[PDB]
Amino acid sequence: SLAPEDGSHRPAAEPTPPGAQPTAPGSLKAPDTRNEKLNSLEDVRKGSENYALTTNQGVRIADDQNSLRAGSRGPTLLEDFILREKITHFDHERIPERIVHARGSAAHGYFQPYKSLSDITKADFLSDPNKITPVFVRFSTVQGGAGSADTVRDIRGFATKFYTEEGIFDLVGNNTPIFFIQDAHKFPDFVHAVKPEPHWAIPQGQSAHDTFWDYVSLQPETLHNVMWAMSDRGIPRSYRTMEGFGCHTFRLINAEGKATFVRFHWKPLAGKASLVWDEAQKLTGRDPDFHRRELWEAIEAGDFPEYE
Amino acid sequence: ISRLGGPNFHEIPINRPTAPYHNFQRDGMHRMGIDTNPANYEPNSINDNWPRETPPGPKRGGFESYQERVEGNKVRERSPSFG
Amino acid sequence: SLAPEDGSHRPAAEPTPPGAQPTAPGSLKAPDTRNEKLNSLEDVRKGSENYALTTNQGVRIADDQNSLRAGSRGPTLLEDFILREKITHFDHERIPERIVHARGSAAHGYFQPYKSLSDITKADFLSDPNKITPVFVRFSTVQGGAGSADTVRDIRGFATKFYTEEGIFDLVGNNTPIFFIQDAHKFPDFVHAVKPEPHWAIPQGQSAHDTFWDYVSLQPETLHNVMWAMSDRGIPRSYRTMEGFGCHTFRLINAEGKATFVRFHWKPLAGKASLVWDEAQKLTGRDPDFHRRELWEAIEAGDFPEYELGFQLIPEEDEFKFDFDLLDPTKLIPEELVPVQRVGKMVLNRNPDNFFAENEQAAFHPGHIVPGLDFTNDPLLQGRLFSYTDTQISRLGGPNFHEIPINRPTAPYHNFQRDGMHRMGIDTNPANYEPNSINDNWPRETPPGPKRGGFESYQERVEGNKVRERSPSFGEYYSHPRLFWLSQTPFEQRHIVDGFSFELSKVVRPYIRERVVDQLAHIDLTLAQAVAKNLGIELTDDQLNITPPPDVNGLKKDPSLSLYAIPDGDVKGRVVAILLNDEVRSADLLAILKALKAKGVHAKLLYSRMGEVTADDGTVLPIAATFAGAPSLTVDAVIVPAGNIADIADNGDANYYLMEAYKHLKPIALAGDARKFKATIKIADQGEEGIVEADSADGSFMDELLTLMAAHRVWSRIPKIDKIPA
Amino acid sequence: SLAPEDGSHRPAAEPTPPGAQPTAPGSLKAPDTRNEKLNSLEDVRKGSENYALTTNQGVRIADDQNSLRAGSRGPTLLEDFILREKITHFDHERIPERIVHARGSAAHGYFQPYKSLSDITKADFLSDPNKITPVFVRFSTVQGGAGSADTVRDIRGFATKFYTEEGIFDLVGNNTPIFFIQDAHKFPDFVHAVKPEPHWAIPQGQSAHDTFWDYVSLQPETLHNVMWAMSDRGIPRSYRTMEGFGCHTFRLINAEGKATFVRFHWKPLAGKASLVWDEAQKLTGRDPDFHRRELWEAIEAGDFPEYELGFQLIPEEDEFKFDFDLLDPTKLIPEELVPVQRVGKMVLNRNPDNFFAENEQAAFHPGHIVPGLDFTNDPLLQGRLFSYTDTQISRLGGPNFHEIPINRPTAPYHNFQRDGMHRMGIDTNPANYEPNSINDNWPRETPPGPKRGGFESYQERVEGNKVRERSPSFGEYYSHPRLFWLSQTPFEQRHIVDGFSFELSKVVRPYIRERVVDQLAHIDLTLAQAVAKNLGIELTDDQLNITPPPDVNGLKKDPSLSLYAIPDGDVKGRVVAILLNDEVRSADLLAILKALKAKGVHAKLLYSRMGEVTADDGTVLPIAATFAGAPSLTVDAVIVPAGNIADIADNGDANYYLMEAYKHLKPIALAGDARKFKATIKIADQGEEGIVEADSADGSFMDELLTLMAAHRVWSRIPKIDKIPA
Ligand code: HDE
Ligand code: HDE
Ligand code: HDD
Ligand SMILES: [S]
Ligand SMILES: [S]
Ligand SMILES: [S]
Structure with missing residues (x-):
């Protein structure tokens, strides 16, 4: 057995403050947090303790340390199906990242109305304060790849998937009340202008480059959301x-x-707060995972993100 | 990988084993299984090295190839015995 | 016309130093640079000047600012095919990134051998000193995504695609001579361990987390490459x-x-040089694109990256002559035992036109060899052979990935393979099989021979049972790490100590730290105790008494393993920050730049704002960046000319610039009153080695500063930096 | 393993009749046939003669007969990169077939208009009788897979890609003037209903099953295109x-x-002709590739497929002037009401080189229009505009399908779209967005105008609420079926009755058959009674009393809806079987071949074995196929010359050959003692219209046979075929 005697490899399955325990997958950290969606995922969750190591076809592996070879210093054999299945799955792990908002961090939760809204909407999830709707929320930046840094200067996305009794409702919002452009036909122009420039693919996670400001100077509709971004x-x-x-x-x-007519808002019950520029920029180097880490650890601690 | 869209084709329902399957492989297109294991590698101590290798044996043992003797040079050559 | 009247939108199509012009696609920047591969990509280059905007189907677009709607405040109509074509193409821009080495930066160039190597290889690209071979080279990190930072602590990849007249040869190498693991079967285990952890996908571009150090602590074979990575x-x-x-x-x-037998080497003709950890980490924040930017700007300046190819050559009959197995990819071959024989020179002299098309789509794979080369039974190389073909089926969409323009051979290619997604080649052969009579059996097999012959594998003897078994000869883990450590200078050793100490401090489970400390006590007690002290761990009496591993074939060090033991400094293409004030002494600045120019060293003129300032004598000095905007992290030395020092003397950013540069061991030069800044970095009046100072910026002021630059960093300064709050 | 010395492996590169030479890729068969599109493909055509066999990476292969193994009876080694590349390409050859029209056959050609149409359209390809536009046309069935049979009962597709100077225009049409359904939203319901049923995936290539007839019985809007399919x-x-x-x-x-408003037509210059059902069905087994083969061989022979483009034109003010809605695609516009105006001619004159690369990957889409053309609110057309771009993303692997060679415009295309899988074009433009100043805004928008202008949509007035609602004017389903029925000849009507009767007999649930017969009673009582009778159904009194739908704007019939009512025969390109005996009368064969040659009619010489027979004068006659190997299904008429008739008089296959031809209404000609075969098909001594007979094959005899062939089939024989057991 490779685990330590004292059991200190395994984080307590109880709320603990940031850095007190190693972080863990949510069903192991908080096994007793449930909602209809989390429960319905149980059919696909797969454990591990006490199970034999197998191929994907259910065949037990005896030696997961070596390839099959003709002598112990010989060539690897084509009939090593265990090696090939393992390396094949590895070779194909990646899927295309999102065209925008590739960088993002997500969590499960629930929503409940304060009162019935039937006078203004027949949406079933807003019909009674007793209606509990599971959600999965993903927060994101916009410009940088999935491996870019969290505390860049950028717009943030805030997308919520409501699993209602009458269908999925996705409220796919951002952290400012407007956008840069008026008509969807310009979206690839604007996004190309803000993204890394096409000859050399620089800069990552930044609007601070010629093509973005070129587009902005030629498209004054952009100026309102540019004011927000620069704040x-x-x-x-x-x-x-x-x-x-x-x-x-x-x-x-x-x-x-x-x-x-309606416009939607989320009001953060933890209040509004931002970094300063020098701090955010240095923080992209000291911990490019800062917001992803902070969200995960707030949840592990019982500091659940709450929005009205 | 092209016919069925990726390396998770064993999760397509008809293809699934009825025998248990557990390992450290992750991700790929169309991933269905949600792995809860803290570890995605072995050897690991953080999950007490589970899931674990199994010695070969008479029943329920791990797969080991028969130790057939190989001897010859690296050649692209048809055996004369096949002629 | 949207372009300015003075044409300042268009970068000069000639070599220019970093920052002097906006950067440009390669064929626009340097239209006169060519080689056989660049010329052959011309059939797919697309221009733009003077052309109409169209759909992909060649239909001219009238209004590219609006969707088609029923009234100007009405709904968008499904019949707007121009909108949907444009949004569809955008919606599907991204392709899977590389499983590993997803972050990388690439350039075109050429290779030429110094003499014919026909006595040792029949590889055509090495047969004639006049034969010039186009290359495409991609450098990369390993762990982080395509959008991760450049100056992380990680292994670096160094992959070269040689477009030879007898096929593509890809030499897919790294910036260290070994790897972490022995058998390819464990590649997904080691990679999963170093990669962001699977519950939360943290951390990016870093091995400083639990699962990495868990795997290392359980797999001592990794220690050799971990030492390199921590240095x-x-x-x-x-x-x-x-x-x-x-x-x-x-x-x-x-x-x-x-x-x-051969092991391949690339020697950097600009010399060996690395950052320090605090600088590298802060630089991932200040400019996560620094290496990609540096390479592109070096090429645009004419500071072409140059490397000498070299071979370590071992005769077949010497296979078992060493203390280690030649097939063990965790073992290096010390140059003291087998010298590097120089083979040729590679020069990278043109940037791509489109990063996605040329860089992101390029596929390198070490199985891509040519007659004159062959493999061995190294069991990590063996499994590599499977992976690099396989992985392209998802990453590049199918088996016609050699038809993507950058991947195309310049050599002829004809065969009986057909179809697949994307198929470009339209085969006119009546036959898609052989043997056939209906096309007189063309294209035809070619016997092997001295030149232009078919590939035949070397007839190596194979003998043994079908086993899944590690060779006993691979089962030694500490002697190579020890030789590496002993080969380092004292300051290099300190940085290794600090690398382990910092990374293990980010491991949350203490037992994992303790376990890695135990492994270090098997390598060198001094190293082990030094790490232990930084972690609050005390070595046991048993740990204190572990016998050090044997030397490697009688060697107790090999200086070729050190970055710095043997000077190989080159200042050409390095950069100096010049800190301006609102009345610079012009005679200092003339003398500074004259001397920098004569050695090919770049300068950036910094101030507290953009725009210009004016020297004592009327000269208008344009500013490149603010102190905050182009931090000392981005330069190799700092020079402060005389003049109105009072202007910047209480500027926080200007002071801090010198403090940061000082901490990171960079040469600093102060002229006249700029000597007032000696207080901010606590320099005594009689001066200190590594701080150049004088009444004015010449006689020997610039020579001194350039001598310091040639030595890269001021290692003697290390004991003074802890006192400095920066 | 090579070509025969006599060169007989290689087809002459000259026009040759069907069967005279092996068929070949277009560029080898007809190397002198060119057009702008065919030439522009030269960048990707790959030859083969005199070239070495290589990997895709350009490495020459020495042994393409064996895997690398350890000993010649040993295991295959993972380092065999030559094997793995070869096998990997093979493993990934297939791409998804088209959701509908998966079975199809294609060729290259050209189009030109007869006169400028600038008074009615500014489309550049219709502007000048001397501007030639290259085309690529694909013909298809609808329901079956890419490996299903050609001569099924189904609608056929007829899609033409015009490579115009102002962009690609695809006219994506079918061989009937309507469709089964009114709104695109229903397309997946209709296509699922006609396709093989989901539990067992039966039947292929056939609407003759329960789900299709279920959907039709429940959706009377389908009945018009059903009538056409059953005919x-x-x-x-x-x-x-x-x-x-x-x-x-x-x-x-x-x-x-x-x-x-315009509706498009193609008129076949070879005339209108169809099979009969027993022949069509049997021919799906004897040659499931019959239409594919016939098209290819017609082009190799010089019988180039020619079509006249024709427009029905309705002025804008006439939109509401008919008793049906112009925008309803279940309604045809009768040519008696709106004549087809001849517009120009299209000639298909070269086969592709590689079926996969050019045919299977071609992408046609009716939203690909050019300035001078526009859409309407037809709610079927509206939804097609979404589907033809969407489906390419999986079928052709991404948004760069226009870069697949067959799909590329010959007109310039430049825009700001970038990346996507297997991106070929390398963009040099410094800008990838507009408006931009950095490239002075190129490529630029172009205002609309008379010629070479940007696309602008016609400013049609839209007034209505957002509704999912079928127009009330679309709610009439029986008058067009009836107009079609009444316009057919009596034999065409019998064939329609037989098609419905055959198909419904394969519907297992009897209430479905009943419901379809009730629909038929709403179209025409005679038709409904005749189908009922074959199904053993009796119409109710109410059914007998259903008022026939109204005439279509006063029309009782329109003869242009019939295949045969107005003669339009063209025998050129047709084919005759000549049944040999071991001593043919050479004088008969001379006159036969001479007369056929004069009218461009081909011949296939058939016998009871392969090889040669020698005629009475010593002429050696090579045999194309046996009686069984090329059945009467595959030919238009049968001639039996004189000679040693005893040789074949009692041959079961020779006799059946005539019984089958006779049953299928084809002209038969018998010379000299071949008149003995009259007994097998029961012709009285006096003769019968449709059987040509004489002492020898002469002027008169061949003229009569050729006149019968110009009338396609011998419809008067229908009463006499019930009795023949064939
Ligand atoms: C205001 C909230 C908002 C707005 C107005 C827009 N984005 Fe978003 N975006 C996609 C396209 C897209 C278009 C075409 C437009 C205007 C026409 C917007 N955006 C503006 C997308 C490419 O389809 C997208 C990428 C992946 C994907 O599934 O959709 C997309 C992402 C996105 C997210 C991320 C949600 C998630 O995956 O976590 C968010 C929060 C927004 N957009 C917000 C948004
Ligand atoms: C020696 C230099 C070196 C070594 C020893 C390895 N890598 Fe690399 N790698 C892939 C897999 C792979 C395996 C299976 C092993 C040992 C078993 C190695 N690596 C060790 C890969 C997943 O097949 C890979 C990902 C993308 C791709 O095309 O192949 C791959 C990448 C890679 C690169 C990137 C090339 C580039 O595009 O810049 C480099 C330089 C290496 N590996 C070096 C390397
Ligand atoms: C909204 C769905 C839809 C509708 C209502 C129609 N089509 Fe369609 N058609 C498709 C959706 C589609 C498709 C799914 O997009 C296909 C197969 C994949 C392809 O590229 O397009 C296609 C293929 C396709 C082809 C084959 C082109 C080729 O050779 O590749 C032809 C000829 C037609 N269609 C003709 C018609 C006609 C005459 C229609 C009646 C007006 C019609 N289609 C309605
Ligand atoms: S928005
Ligand atoms: S390696
Ligand atoms: S249609």
């Missing part, structure tokens, strides 16, 4: 301490068919 | 100033059929 | 002998901005 809105302390917005006018529709 | 080798100054190595014993095969 | 239009003789239609109302837009 400390662009460098939040924490995903827990920023606002969210649905960015557009949508409609609510009630049982009578009456339409009301 | 300053893990944080190179530039891809131009690191070594490259082919990792494995391969074979050369000559026309007579004789095999010679 | 002989469902079983064309050749892609060269069917009509094509564009299916929807589109718009032509002239330089002045005037919109005209």
